[PDB]
């Protein structure tokens, strides 16, 4: 605090007393310089304190409003930021097994059930089109999730069994394309 109006008066009284006690003048003259400077301190703090209180109110208001804002901000975006953080952690984690199925799913290789781990146990995946099959279904062994699966029961969207050998690019434009493959691990 400095540029305050009452500080002008306090400064005047202080400088006047400085000059008076420098000249070393009478005692009857400082009777003012005391009854005129004490008041300066009086008429002065009763305003530096008052603005000071407001100066703390400003803080304890801003410091509240800020967090109040960013609070409801963060409780607006969970089911969004959460997913992207998840996939960020995925990409950083780096496991070919995962990336395989993740790309496959960007493509369409959605499994209709949980991937099992038992040497037996069945698996049901979906295939949209031919090349997907060709990029995946090779003979009767199936390479999925970087694992080897035995192809046993192909069926198209008409829910009818279709001959594995029939599957080839030539006659493929005749099939209920959402193909549902079933298999077992090695």
């Amino acid at each position: 605090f400095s540029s305050l109006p009452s500080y002008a008066a306090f400064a005047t009284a202080q400088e006047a007393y400085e000059q008076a006690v420098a000249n070393g003048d009478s005692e009857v003259v400082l009777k003012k310089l005391k009854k005129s400077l004490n008041v300066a301190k009086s008429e002065f703090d009763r305003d530096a304190a008052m603005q000071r209180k407001l100066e703390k109110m400003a803080d304890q208001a801003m410091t509240q409003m800020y967090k109040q804002a960013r609070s409801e901000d963060k409780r607006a975006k969970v089911t969004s930021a959460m997913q992207t953080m998840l996939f960020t952690m995925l990409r950083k984690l780096d496991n070919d097994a995962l990336n395989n199925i993740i790309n496959n799913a960007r493509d369409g290789c959605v499994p209709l059930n949980i991937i099992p781990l038992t040497t037996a146990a069945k698996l049901m995946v979906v295939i949209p089109d031919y090349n997907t099959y060709k990029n995946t279904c090779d003979g009767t062994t199936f390479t999925y999730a970087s694992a080897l699966w035995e192809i046993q029961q192909v069926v198209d969207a008409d829910s009818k069994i279709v001959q594995l050998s029939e599957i080839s690019m030539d006659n493929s434009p005749n099939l209920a394309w959402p193909l549902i493959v079933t298999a077992l691990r090695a």
């Binding site: 703390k56 803080d59 801003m62 800020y66 967090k67 609070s71 963060k74």
Partner: protein, 121 residues
């Protein structure tokens, strides 16, 4: 004693003499740092006091023979510091003038924690 209320005990020279102090189980502290209930800690730039208290609980690890322990303490310290720093930076842009008097610097000086273990209060 080997363990009591899930605290271990360690005999440390506090200045002139030797005193028994309870230090917790670090894994517990770390876990409390890493997993919470939504808004809590997530954007902890509004929750410093959590870490203040936590560090309080993890002070005695400073006096420990094994290494990584005290590293936990220093970790919490530096994290508090970075927290407050990037907080003030945001608050400045939000308005245009930083706060007048924070007095939060004491929180990242070790001595204040040490006071919580000395017989005079």
């Amino acid at each position: 004693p080997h363990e009591f209320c899930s605290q271990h005990t360690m005999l440390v020279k506090q200045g002139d003499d030797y005193v028994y102090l309870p230090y917790p189980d670090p894994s517990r502290i770390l876990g409390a740092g890493c997993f919470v209930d939504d808004i809590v800690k997530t954007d902890g730039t509004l929750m410093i006091e959590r870490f203040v208290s936590l560090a309080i609980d993890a002070y005695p690890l400073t006096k420990h023979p094994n290494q990584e322990y005290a590293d936990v303490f220093h970790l919490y310290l530096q994290y508090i510091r970075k927290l407050h720093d990037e907080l003030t930076g945001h608050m400045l842009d939000m308005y245009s003038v930083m706060l007048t008097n924070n007095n939060t610097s004491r929180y990242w000086e070790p001595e204040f924690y040490e006071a919580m273990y000395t017989p005079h209060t």
